[PDB]
Amino acid sequence: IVGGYTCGANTVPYQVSLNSGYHFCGGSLINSQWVVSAAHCYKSGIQVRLGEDNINVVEGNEQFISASKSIVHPSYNSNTLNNDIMLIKLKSAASLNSRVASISLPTSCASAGTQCLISGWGNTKSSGTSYPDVLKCLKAPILSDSSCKSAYPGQITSNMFCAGYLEGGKDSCQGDSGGPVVCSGKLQGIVSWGSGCAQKNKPGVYTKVCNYVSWIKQTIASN
Numbered sequence: 310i311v312g313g314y315t316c317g318a319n320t321v322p323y324q325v326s327l328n329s330g331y332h333f334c335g336g337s338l339i340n341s342q343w344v345v346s347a348a349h350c351y352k353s354g355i356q357v358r359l360g361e362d363n364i365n366v367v368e369g370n371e372q373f374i375s376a377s378k379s380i381v382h383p384s385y386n387s388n389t390l391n392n393d394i395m396l397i398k399l400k401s402a403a404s405l406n407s408r409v410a411s412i413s414l415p416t417s418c419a420s421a422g423t424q425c426l427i428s429g430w431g432n433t434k435s436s437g438t439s440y441p442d443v444l445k446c447l448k449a450p451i452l453s454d455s456s457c458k459s460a461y462p463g464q465i466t467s468n469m470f471c472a473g474y475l476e477g478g479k480d481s482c483q484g485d486s487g488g489p490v491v492c493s494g495k496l497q498g499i500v501s502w503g504s505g506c507a508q509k510n511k512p513g514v515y516t517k518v519c520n521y522v523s524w525i526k527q528t529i530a531s532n
């Protein structure tokens with residue numbers, strides 16, 4: 310997260326870190342046994358880390374649970390990142406508490422202009438590299454589909470939306486993928502991609518979760 314601020318220990322209880330010997334992507338807890346992340350974050354041997362703040366220090370509120378299965382969206386396209394979403398099941402149910410909580414799925418898609426909270430342990434510099442150990446936060450509005458497609462002509466599908474500021478300086482970045490975009494108490498986006506980080510006229514692109522609620526509910530119910 311570039312241009313954001315330190316969230317505060319466990320102020321984002323649904324935020325999870327996907328670990329394969331090191332943090333490689335973020336994710337969102339949707340219930341005690343399931344996590345939502347980006348399809349491009351898929352890999353074998355994933356360990357979900359909940360209740361984290363400083364990912365390099367065991368502070369006392371974390372729960373490390375191995376994934377038992379991963380399900381990449383049936384229409385995921387690794388080249389264009391269309392349908393960039395995946396489900397990860399925990400080998401054992403997480404113990405839900407105030408610092409480890411699930412985030413609700415959308416009932417309807419959010420409108421442009423709606424303010425959202427984007428979070429992650431990604432790079433904090435737009436022209437360099439500096440990874441934070443504590444969770445970073447960023448308030449960002451959903452941009453019109455017009456400004457989104459204008460910035461990325463021919464690259465935006467109906468399964469993506471842009472959020473951020475066209476002026477640049479504030480945005481998600483590498484290390485944030487798979488992470489949450491929460492608006493009005495619901496998971497509306499998943500950190501997906503973008504042109505560089507926090508660059509003017511190049512806002513962050515996020516998977517549009519509202520288009521997948523049906524798939525998520527049916528998939529988790531059958532697995």
Ligand SMILES: *[C@](=O)([C]([C][C][C][N]C([N])=[N])[N]C(=O)[C]1[C][C]([O])[C]N1C([C])=O)C1=NC2=C([C]=[C][C]=[C]2)S1
Pocket residue numbers: 349390431480481482483484485486487500501502503504505506507511512513514
């Ligand atoms: C993700 O943390 C980043 C998030 C980038 C957010 N960008 C924005 N908000 N301006 N995404 C990657 O860097 C993606 C994935 C690839 O398809 C290409 N790239 C683009 C164009 O954004 C990460 N994803 C990966 C990382 C490391 C290795 C593989 C995927 S970090």
Ligand SMILES: [Ca+2]
Pocket residue numbers: 361362363364365366367368369371
């Ligand atoms: Ca920790």
